[PDB]
Amino acid sequence: RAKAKTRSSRAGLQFPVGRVHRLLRKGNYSERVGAGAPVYLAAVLEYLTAEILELAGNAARDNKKTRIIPRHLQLAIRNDEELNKLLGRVTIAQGGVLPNIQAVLLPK
Amino acid sequence: PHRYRPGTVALREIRRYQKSTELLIRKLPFQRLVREIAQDFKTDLRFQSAAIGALQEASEAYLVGLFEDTNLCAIHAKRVTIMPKDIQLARRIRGERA
Amino acid sequence: PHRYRPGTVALREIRRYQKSTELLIRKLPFQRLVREIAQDFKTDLRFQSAAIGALQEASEAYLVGLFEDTNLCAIHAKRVTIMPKDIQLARRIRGERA
Amino acid sequence: SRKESYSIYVYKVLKQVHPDTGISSKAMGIMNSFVNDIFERIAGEASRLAHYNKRSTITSREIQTAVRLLLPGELAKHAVSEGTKAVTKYTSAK
């Protein structure tokens, strides 16, 4: 019996391939699941997570903080066009709104 | 020479076109436009006739609904003429535009 | 004998509340309202604290979005004051009312 | 009585992108919600794709097509690149 290595390490990933496979098999999506579907899905999920985290960390740094809070995630999402399209009908709790005042309301 | 005032014929056409069900765009130009748009995604594509028929029905329904919203926006501003600003406001509130 | 002109404190309030993230409604009145609305569907109902928290968060987000749409409809008509007709127009175009 | 989540993997990804940055518990809860939401979206699209074509198996082809159907352009291109690279590496150095 050789020493076990996770499928994530084989795929060069951080997200759990075995857990994604188990969730696919117990969700009533199909009758059978191929070998490469959980690897592909875990890679896509990792990529999207990294994109959002990279934007939110820049927002937190620009506010002079070392921790990320929901406001930073909201600013990152609402200032980026693709993310704003993807999460258009989503509400983030304690995220607030983007500062925007119309020009007519401003004083002359 | 007999003549009608501006608005009589327009109301006649509104009544006439709100009573029928036939398509209002010609089929051949719409077909050419669909093939032209599709050329970007894939070359040497073929179409069933029912696919282009479905596309045309969807397109006309979408445009008629948008014109209804635009007319509401124009009347809200104390006008009877529709302008591009009304279309922009309607599309913004519907959510088809940040 | 020191007074600000109308609109100065309003702009300060806009800048103050577009920067914070806290809830703007008192918790006890909102909880009373939720329990009273719920008592019509079923009697003797209990609520988790997180359930009322989620309801309040969703309600405030919904109202803020509606107010932004209402402001756009009011500026379209060459005004700075929002009126009930702006709310009705925004809700009709959003599709929440026929 | 044991409840699973994505917190440790999100923390690893964060430590990769921003080595000296932390996160709060509420932000991590929002991240878990995001991951679950995107998972269900992609899985449902792939399930419908398999049903349309009269297939019993969900493969990486269905995942790729669902990703192209659900993501905006550049996001979809880079996600397809990452997924293809991961599958090649997995099948490469088995």
């Binding site: 980026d80 | 940040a98 | - | 291109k77």
Partner: peptide
């Protein structure tokens, strides 16, 4: 299907009324 570098991030344009 594999590509190079980062993606082209874009700005969201908001409707303004003259």
């Amino acid at each position: 299907l594999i590509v190079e570098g980062k993606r082209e991030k874009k700005k969201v344009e908001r409707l303004t009324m003259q």
